[PDB]
Design a protein around this ligand. Sequence first.
Ligand SMILES: Cc1ncc(COP(=O)(O)O)c(CN[C@@H](CS)C(=O)O)c1O
Ligand SMILES: Cc1ncc(COP(=O)(O)O)c(CN[C@@H](CS)C(=O)O)c1O
Ligand SMILES: [Cl-]
Ligand SMILES: [Cl-]
Lengths: 358, 358
Amino acid sequence: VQRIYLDNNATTRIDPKVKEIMDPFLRDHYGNPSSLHQFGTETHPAIAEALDKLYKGINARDIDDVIITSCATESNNWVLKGVYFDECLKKGKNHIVTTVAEHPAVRSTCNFLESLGVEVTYLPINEHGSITAEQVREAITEKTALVSVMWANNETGLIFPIEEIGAICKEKGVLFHTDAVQAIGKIPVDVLKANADFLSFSAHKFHGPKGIGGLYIRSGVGLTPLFHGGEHMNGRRSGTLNVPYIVGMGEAMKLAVEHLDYEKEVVGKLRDKLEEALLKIPDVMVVGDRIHRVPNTTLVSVRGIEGEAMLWDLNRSNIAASTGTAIRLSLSRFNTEAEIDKTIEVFSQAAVRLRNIS
Amino acid sequence: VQRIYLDNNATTRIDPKVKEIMDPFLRDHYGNPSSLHQFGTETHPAIAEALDKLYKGINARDIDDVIITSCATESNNWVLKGVYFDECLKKGKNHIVTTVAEHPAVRSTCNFLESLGVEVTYLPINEHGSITAEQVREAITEKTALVSVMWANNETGLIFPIEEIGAICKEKGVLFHTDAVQAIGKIPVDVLKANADFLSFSAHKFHGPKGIGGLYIRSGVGLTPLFHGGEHMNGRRSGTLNVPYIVGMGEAMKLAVEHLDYEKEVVGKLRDKLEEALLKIPDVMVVGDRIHRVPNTTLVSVRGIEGEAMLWDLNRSNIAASTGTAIRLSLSRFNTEAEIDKTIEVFSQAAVRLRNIS
Ligand SMILES: Cc1ncc(COP(=O)(O)O)c(CN[C@@H](CS)C(=O)O)c1O
Ligand SMILES: Cc1ncc(COP(=O)(O)O)c(CN[C@@H](CS)C(=O)O)c1O
Ligand SMILES: [Cl-]
Ligand SMILES: [Cl-]
């Protein structure tokens, strides 16, 4: 059989060099990096190389932290529940601004925060699909503790004007968090450009394992731990390190940035190939702006066919993709022109076969 | 070279069958268990078998939850920060009772809670080393929201009278949490016997990977999420599942309980062998009760030699162990009588060589 994987915004295959690099930490280098003896200290260089990889990947400096967490869901909960205690309670700033596009980790967390009496402005998205920047200017009051906007959208692939929000954020002395989960490996990421205080990411969107991620915290910026016990990660996040995943996610980030050109000019080309080949059907609208998207995503709709129906069918022919109803097709560097040609065929055939019904 | 590993209360080697069982989830079964297509659904049986393994390991029933988390540090933070919102705030019960023996995850979390104005009673430990039970009877007031006592101590190996506390807890209508991290694989565990509402554990203490653990939540018992986004784990803990680690930790628990006899009557025998062979030196006190300990741990002290000094030396001869100052030696089923004989030698030689100094 030959299955075709087009659901990379949901998760990604672990790159072989990633699996390879973590292996020794699953086999004989199983010591606790906190231990003082050989088993512990032996793990130190490999963890250090991994972290360097992380910092170079997001252009973070020595004075900043990139804290290892168990996923972006953790990072997101941590940023919001931390500003809550640090700013909303202790400092009166009882308002957070965010978008309606944000991943449920941020939105649900907020929903809980307003449960406790925080006022949260959920920015609505325009006809362009995206968020303006001026929208956050206009919403930042002076109770405003944090603004959270995701770098790229998981559903549409749309890039948001981070930097702009970065600047409108610096100028107004407000805390700025970007959930950058769908941007690693997909476009260049730079916390310095973005004047981010906080950035989230998750490894399994750039070919490392599920079960690990990162929060960039800028120097001097405080954030009350979500995992108290303050032993690991400079006391910022307690719990025995996930050695294998740390090493692996490091390699993952490195390869992710080293493929940024390829993502740009190959996967993007394959995406365009698929997309415009798909636009030659009936009422095959693409959903949203088509210029400010990550290279790998396309979100198409179809005449009278539910997205859910088209996907179930595509599965039968061993093609994997998600909703977004419309149909989200998200590539990676592992896809091939052969596959998308195949996809074009299987897509169109499914399309007109599902519509036959009067 | 031949290193001897005696630091199992710090972390454990991943059992080979564990590494083996997770492998396919690092290679071609990398789908998101939430996806609706083949890549996702394919992972379902293996996750289900893993969870069954977890439930059978702690004698939890169908109506209870065993929620996957990223470690015991997460579980501990989750129980305490959840009762805070559910009971302390929303319901007036502003008091938590716990021990001074507890792992810093629980103690630090509490320290933060009293920072917000919770009254936390830290129970002191007796000359016996342990906690009475009557001590928690006497401390449970009516603002009392939760009592948290660890099943077994990481430092001394001492078992606490869970069940007794279970009963004193049922009777007084108080929420009962046991951190059981050092009890899995070491003695039988039973939430039913223990009348636990909450139980924490971490895989890397019973030969699975660092970076995963569990919280048992009893049916009908609520606990406000620590990871909001409510998609995975019945909305109780959001974040993409850590597929490989889940499968592995399942196998880990299974093998852990299947070795409970061996832990009892082999590793315990090896521990006794080491311990009484070590008691034949000078002022080689063992620290604490010696009857109510898990089979694998011994915590010995020495005349005038600092523990830290003895450990540094032991490392040079490739023997790994921790402090607890005194000296904690924690075995696993992977140790061998050959090793402990060797240890006896290397220990005594180090002892009298470090003391030579006038
Ligand atoms: C922007 C963003 N932020 C957070 C997450 C979740 O990360 P975790 O590693 O699961 O915690 C995701 C992943 N959303 C996937 C799976 S639910 C999708 O199908 O769109 C994301 O895209
Ligand atoms: C009772 C108990 N509770 C929690 C933990 C920490 O679990 P994590 O998986 O790191 O979150 C531990 C592990 N304490 C180790 C390493 S710090 C020791 O050397 O004693 C524990 O023993
Ligand atoms: Cl918190
Ligand atoms: Cl919480």
